[PDB]
Amino acid sequence: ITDSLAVVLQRRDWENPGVTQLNRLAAHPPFASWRNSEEARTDRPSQQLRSLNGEWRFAWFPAPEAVPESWLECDLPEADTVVVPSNWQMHGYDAPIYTNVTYPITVNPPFVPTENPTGCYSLTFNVDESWLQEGQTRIIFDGVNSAFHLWCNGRWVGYGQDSRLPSEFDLSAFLRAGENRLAVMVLRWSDGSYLEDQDMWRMSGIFRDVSLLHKPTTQISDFHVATRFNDDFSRAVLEAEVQMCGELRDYLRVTVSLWQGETQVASGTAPFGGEIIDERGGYADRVTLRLNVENPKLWSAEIPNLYRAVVELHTADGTLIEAEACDVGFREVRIENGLLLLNGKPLLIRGVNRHEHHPLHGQVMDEQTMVQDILLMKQNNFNAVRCSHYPNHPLWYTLCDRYGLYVVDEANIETHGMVPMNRLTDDPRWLPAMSERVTRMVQRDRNHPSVIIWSLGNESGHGANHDALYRWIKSVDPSRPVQYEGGGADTTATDIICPMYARVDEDQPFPAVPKWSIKKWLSLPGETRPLILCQYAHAMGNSLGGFAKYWQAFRQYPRLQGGFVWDWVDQSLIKYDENGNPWSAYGGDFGDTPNDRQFCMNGLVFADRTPHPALTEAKHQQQFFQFRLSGQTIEVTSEYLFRHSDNELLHWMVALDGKPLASGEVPLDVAPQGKQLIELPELPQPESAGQLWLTVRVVQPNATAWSEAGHISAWQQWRLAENLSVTLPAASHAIPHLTTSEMDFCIELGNKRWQFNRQSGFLSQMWIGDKKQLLTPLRDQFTRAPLDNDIGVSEATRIDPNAWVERWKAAGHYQAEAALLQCTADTLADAVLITTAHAWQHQGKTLFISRKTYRIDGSGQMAITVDVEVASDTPHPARIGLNCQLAQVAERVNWLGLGPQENYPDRLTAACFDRWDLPLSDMYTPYVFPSENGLRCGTRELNYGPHQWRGDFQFNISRYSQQQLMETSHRHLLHAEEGTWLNIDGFHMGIGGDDSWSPSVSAEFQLSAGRYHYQLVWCQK
Ligand SMILES: CC1(C)C(/C=C/c2ccc(O[C@@H]3O[C@H](CO)[C@H](O)[C@H](O)[C@H]3O)cc2)=[N+](Cc2ccc(C(=O)O)cc2)c2ccccc21
Ligand SMILES: [Mg+2]
Ligand SMILES: [Mg+2]
Ligand code: NA
Ligand code: NA
């Protein structure tokens, strides 16, 4: 009767932060209850841990009150069969909602809409007679979003909250021999939802693994593993605290053994009975075993050395009762004289924030995707990952233990959308709900070596509950620093100054919560802590402009120890069009309103894990080898802390304007933090015009667990000698002819002709035979299809006048019409020369003036000179160049300049000057929200079809006009236009990225000069 839905739902436990659970079992490190010690040692499956993943029955309801009572005792006929784990949104049952700060429900704590989508999962399953005769059978829900009641065989078992930590219940008294039925009622919204306002898709369901665990009545209930060292790390002590439940008997003993492969390194045995704690005695149900280990192999992300600990509960008889185990990493984390140290050395954090996202399965994680993420991270020189912003799938910490990544483990607490952010975290009545989110994380993950820093959550202001739970962790686990960014990044609840989007040089003095220059922040009076940015370099679309500025400062300042980029992967989701072709969706593409559109996509990699261009810029700046050149000696500095360069070659190549002359390879032998001098053999010194370039690459000859043989780890380029060309062009055998109309100036030379419209003032057509070459005239361009960083948070709903796109729009940059001031022809002895002069205006104010000269000579080459004035009081323009739409569509693009990948003025350090030859496809970057893209910088020669351009310019080349990109909201709606659109810019504004909601382009990358000059030569070859 009291099992009925009517009575259980009556209490409304999901609108009460004083009930976070009912009858839920205590939290602990991962268990498997092996009944054989060698299976435990080898980490092989345990027949005491069943998976209940697979096909369940599921049914959707608009509110829990709509669930019929029949559902408790038999399957609903309207129910479907569904795979678990899953998010029910990904099966089309209701919409996923993408909102950033604003809560997806009315803010009215602790209450929740009565429209509360409800997932009714059920499973019929068998249990062996063995499990019911002896011991304890429990069920483990690794992840239920956001709360749930549990029935088994019609009887109510319990209730659970916190979406990202395992909820476990005892099923012993509820199971029967043979057929049993689980009934799990999952609520999309709960009072827990008030602490789960992370900027991400809001989904729901049983989205992590479901398991049964069988333990004996007398059991290992908890164990903690600590490692302490002497000053030089030549000796360690492993302390293992083991706790038990059940009937204590004097014959009970515990053995803890430490292995390294098949070598047993130490072992101890003891009865239960701890040291004296206070005036009432000690813990009779606990024992600590202390093992000596001489010259331990130490854990780091550089070399992830692991031991294995095996904990046997047995009798004096030797009868094994059960065994648990974990991997062990010998490493020490401490902050000492203002620096974060690991094994006595200062870490430099090459970090990234990473969400649990999959474009098809939503927030369900798999081993394959996890491994793919880790490989991609290490291959791009990433040290560390921040679990933003919740405890991860348990397998993640095992994988980072083994592959070697430093992990920040973060409690599932974000209250961003409250006003102020403080509201719940400063309120004592919410302390219990918060403590369970902090304490149960620590109790689960404290034995993982890869976790080096605990975090109290994200974006919840600073309340007294943070201070309380900061001190809880410090008392319970001294071995790791605690950090938290809320309330100004330097509150009393953080051992590390952990700002988000603090800039390098520029102060943002917001009241109460300023973001100082990270350099100035360190020096403020009384401040002694290190500074590691919790989030930095917002990688939203065409971003990471200014990334090198950070890493220069990280390398110069000891107490700037890096940061975590925001963030790893685009949170795009897959939809299907009328033909079943997939496309990538973002905010509002599911009827979800209100939403925050494209802001779900901030990754360095697309959702399928293909890299954005910015990934290589990060790889370059975060490389572990630094290079200097004096003469033709190379100084290689290693930023590794623990390992020699014992899988590294240096390849070097010298080349003249792309043409290789000399190469060669040198073994690399640099000690950690050491230097190696390499003198290069006598290098070529040709008399040829052009520029000589030295390029070095570090190459790993052997495969790793994370990379292929031949993997490139770092690179650097220097200009050696230059030779300015002095030679006179070969004399031509003909002079071009000028034909003057009232309408046109036309120029002829051989089969070639050039037409200059005298009404417009632009080169409107060019001929080679009967084949015309332009579909659009060659005109000036002072605008770009705005990037995410240009737009910021501006919408048609609420315009943000301060963003770049809106200052451009307000000033008429986008609707300015060219007004010709001058267009004259002149014949001279060698060539014909057209001079032009245009003004761009808007409502009586002149924005730009453009003075040009076209010189067509007997060699068939058109020399263009441009001299642009920009009014001092108009917003600095996005670019200064020319555009046109060619008739040609060639397969290839050949250029000499920075490449091969997309690069922009404030993000070109990773690009190298060489001859690059790619398909036209690769000259467009398929950002899901389309914008300016594919620019290549510092180019001297561009080759497309019969055409060739020469000068010193930046260019993009595509089948997509700047008009189409600016007007199209999704990449999958783009259509190839007739021919090819070409933008050639003398100058181009930076892209920014320090954040994506305020102007972020540093002054030195703003086109502020007032007058500009660039020069081009158009020819056919
Ligand atoms: C913290 C800061 C800088 C902020 C807001 C910060 C923010 C915004 C969005 C965020 O979303 C996401 O969350 C994810 C975590 O779950 C990630 O962190 C990710 O990075 C983001 O996509 C996060 C922080 N503003 C906005 C603003 C608005 C306008 C102006 C202006 O024009 O003058 C200036 C400041 C203000 C305004 C006054 C004082 C302080 C701020
Ligand atoms: Mg509750
Ligand atoms: Mg947030
Ligand atoms: Na540093
Ligand atoms: Na975001």
From Swiss-Prot:
Binding site for Na(+): 199, 599, 602
Keyword field: Glycosidase, Hydrolase, Magnesium, Manganese, Metal-binding, Sodium
Feature type site, description Transition state stabilizer: 355, 389
Catalytic residues of the enzyme: 459 (proton donor), 535 (nucleophile)
GO cellular component: beta-galactosidase complex
Cofactors that this protein relies on: Mg(2+); Mn(2+); Na(+)
Site entry (Important for ensuring that an appropriate proportion of lactose is converted to allolactose), positions: 997
Recorded consequence of changing residue 997 to F/G/L/T: Decreases affinity for substrate
A single BP term in Gene Ontology: lactose catabolic process
Binding site for substrate: 100, 199, 459, 535-538, 602, 997
Cofactor binding, per record: Binds 2 magnesium ions per monomer. Can also use manganese. Binds 1 sodium ion per monomer.
Protein activity control: Inhibited by phenylethyl thio-beta-D-galactoside (PETG), isopropyl thio-beta-D-galactoside (IPTG), L-ribose, D-galactonolactone, lactose and 2-amino-D-galactose.
Effect noted on mutating residue 795 to D/Q: Small increase of the catalytic efficiency, when the sodium concentration increases
MF-aspect GO terms: alkali metal ion binding; beta-galactosidase activity; carbohydrate binding; identical protein binding; magnesium ion binding
SS bonds (residue pairs): none
Stated consequence of mutating residue 792 to A: It forces the apoenzyme to adopt the closed rather than the open conformation. Reduces the binding affinity
Outcome (variant: residue 459 to H): Slowly inactivates galactosidase activity by reducing the binding of magnesium. It increases binding specificity
Matching Gene3D superfamilies: 2.70.98.10, Galactose-binding domain-like, Glycosidases, Immunoglobulins
Effect on the protein upon substituting residue 795 to A/L: The catalytic efficiency is not increased, when the sodium concentration increases
Family: Belongs to the glycosyl hydrolase 2 family.
Subunit structure: Homotetramer.
Protein name in the entry: Beta-galactosidase
Organism in which the protein naturally occurs: Escherichia coli (strain K12)
